[PDB]
């Protein structure tokens, strides 16, 4: 199944963090990278006392179960020094969010797929569209069409 993973970093040299994350993603068992987006510099959503993010997206072919993929993505965040602040939407060395797990709908305590907020975020949708322009969501909406309706500002390259 193709998992679509959003990458963000706004601490400790984002470019190096995102490069490290891409290598580590390719090292996950039973999985391989299919496609990587460009790197974009995005203003923070949420608290404004934090740096701009590097945002990207990756398509990862995998035979892992979703929660097992999550165990691996969380492990890469911790390998890259991720610390969870008390505040919501605060800065991170590395954030790996599972946007889509093929066409699955998952609702568990650890995992909500499609990612709960991705449809509201140009920093998630634009890199996804770069790597998967024909994507259709589980609910039947086309990515291409969502971007139309919302008319989110285009992003700037890192
Ligand atoms: N699709 C998904 N991808 C990644 N983590 C998910 C997820 N759905 C639920 N989670 C859960 O989200 C929890 C908190 O992860 P965090 O990375 O701290 C949230 P965040 O990415 O900072 O905010 P965001 O989800 O609004 O982007 C995880 O422990 C994980 O169990
Ligand atoms: N621009 C931008 N803002 C964010 C980001 C992100 O990746 N990019 N992710 C967040 C929570 O994970 C909080 N805010
Ligand atoms: Cl959907
Ligand atoms: Mg996130
Ligand atoms: Mg996250």
**What gap in Å lies between CA 13 and CA 88, rounded to an integer?**
21
Q: Residue 149 to residues 14, 55, 114, 145: CA-CA distances in angstroms?
A: 31, 22, 19, 6
- Give the number of other CB atoms < 10 A from CB of residue 48: 7
**What gap in Å lies between CA 140 and CA 153, rounded to an integer?**
24
- Out of 10, 21, 97, 128, mutate this one to test ligand 1's pocket (max ligand atoms within 8 Å of CB): namely 97
Whether the upstream peptide bond of residue 22 has omega within 30° of 0, thus cis, is: no
Closest to 53 (Cα-Cα) out of 2, 100, 90:
90
Structural determination approach: X-ray
Structural domain boundaries of the chain? Answer: 1-158
> CATH number of the domain at 1-158, please?
3.30.70.560
Closest to 128 (Cα-Cα) out of 57, 35, 75, 66:
57
């Amino acid at each position: 199944t193709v998992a679509y993973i959003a990458i963000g970093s706004n601490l400790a040299s984002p470019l190096e963090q995102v490069n490290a994350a891409l290598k580590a993603l390719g090292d996950i068992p039973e999985s391989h990278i299919l496609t990587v987006s460009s790197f974009y510099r995005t203003p923070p959503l949420g608290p404004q006392d934090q740096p701009d993010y590097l945002n990207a997206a990756v398509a990862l072919e995998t035979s892992l179960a979703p929660e097992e993929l999550l165990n691996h993505t969380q492990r890469i965040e911790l390998q890259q020094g991720r610390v969870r602040k008390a505040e919501r939407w605060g800065p991170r060395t590395l954030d790996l969010d599972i946007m889509l797990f093929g066409n699955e709908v998952i609702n568990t305590e650890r995992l909500t797929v499609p990612h709960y907020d991705m449809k509201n975020r140009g920093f998630m949708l634009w890199p996804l569209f770069e790597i998967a322009p024909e994507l259709v969501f589980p609910d039947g909406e086309m990515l291409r069409q969502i971007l139309h309706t919302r008319a989110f500002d285009k992003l700037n390259k890192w």
